[PDB]
Symmetry: C2
């Protein structure tokens, strides 16, 4: 009954290793975007913004894309080469960012631009008068996070789920989890619950 105890500890240690890596990713990304939003000289040269987004996005496989929105929510700069004009004024994160005038981290969803699952960090750009003028938007690929976890822990079963039971992603074979209770824990900045299943004793 006590190889079990060790397997439960190993799980708890994976839980922490893994939340940290993701909490870092998100925290660092917010930090970068916040820097950009402060350092932009007004009025914004859209071409200049574009080159900065490209420099930033280069070599960070984490990013699905990075985008700049006008006050109306039209994508005005984009690391993804667009085939139509895109407007995001209807996305919850947009609406929430506009309202709160605070940074926002969205739930997962399927990218309007790339069609794959992602979640985004949105940072409104403010005025002297504290009006939102523009929005910086970084989108992170969910699958990137899956693989991050899957390469370090292929033989554990780990699922991440949001507050409403939506499956964000799952790593490993669910078989490795049978007769197991999972060790769980929420992330810092999104309300995703990670669940790490102890391995069974042999």
């Amino acid at each position: 009954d006590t190889i079990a105890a060790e397997h439960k500890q190993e799980a708890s240690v994976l839980l922490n290793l893994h939340r940290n890596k993701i909490n870092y990713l998100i925290g660092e990304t917010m930090a970068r975007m916040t820097s950009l939003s402060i350092a932009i000289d007004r009025p914004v040269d859209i071409k200049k913004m574009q080159s900065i987004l490209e420099k930033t996005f280069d070599s960070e496989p984490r990013f699905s894309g990075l985008y700049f929105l006008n006050a109306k929510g039209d994508v005005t700069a984009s690391t993804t080469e667009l085939k139509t004009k895109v407007n995001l004024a209807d996305a919850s994160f947009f609406i929430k960012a506009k309202e709160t005038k605070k940074t926002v981290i969205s739930d997962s969803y399927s990218s309007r631009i790339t069609g794959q699952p992602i979640f985004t960090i949105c940072v409104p750009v403010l005025d002297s008068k504290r009006n939102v003028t523009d929005y910086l938007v970084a989108a992170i690929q969910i699958d990137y996070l899956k693989n991050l976890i899957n390469l370090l822990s292929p033989d554990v079963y780990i699922e991440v789920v949001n507050q409403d039971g939506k499956m964000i992603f799952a790593s490993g074979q669910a078989s490795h989890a049978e007769d197991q209770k999972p060790v769980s824990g929420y992330l810092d900045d999104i309300s995703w619950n990670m669940k790490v299943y102890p391995n069974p004793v042999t």
Copy 2:
């Protein structure tokens, strides 16, 4: 029991990673913050606008002793700390290393030439397009702030932070608690600081 020992040894290995990761994050996030500045600032750099960005950045960030901006010569030309007499940092270890390497540098701990407090600095060279160093972003962080961070979670364990040469960076907790214990220890990612967490003893 030996059973309860291995447990406390692990309670401590859990603390090592917890705290290492917290500092590792603190440093990396700060680097990222400065890196993004160098990238997005219009060049050539306007110090008025620079001065304002540093102030905005230093806002709600008890992390910092201060943010500074240096020119190629090492003169502090923007600062979040009200300066009396013109300051130059060309002689600073980290400055020399930064000019040289044209890469980000994380200093060891030392006493602030500016605030007289114990700090360590992150120095990010600002490069022109021909890859020449034109300026330097400098972020100073209070060692105090880090002590508090550890203390906040584990005020009842003994944690020692020491550099590659045996210099005490800081200690958190009462050393009484370390008696008869071997520490679970490990180095940070971006500074050569070795963190040592001493298991709690048995009831």
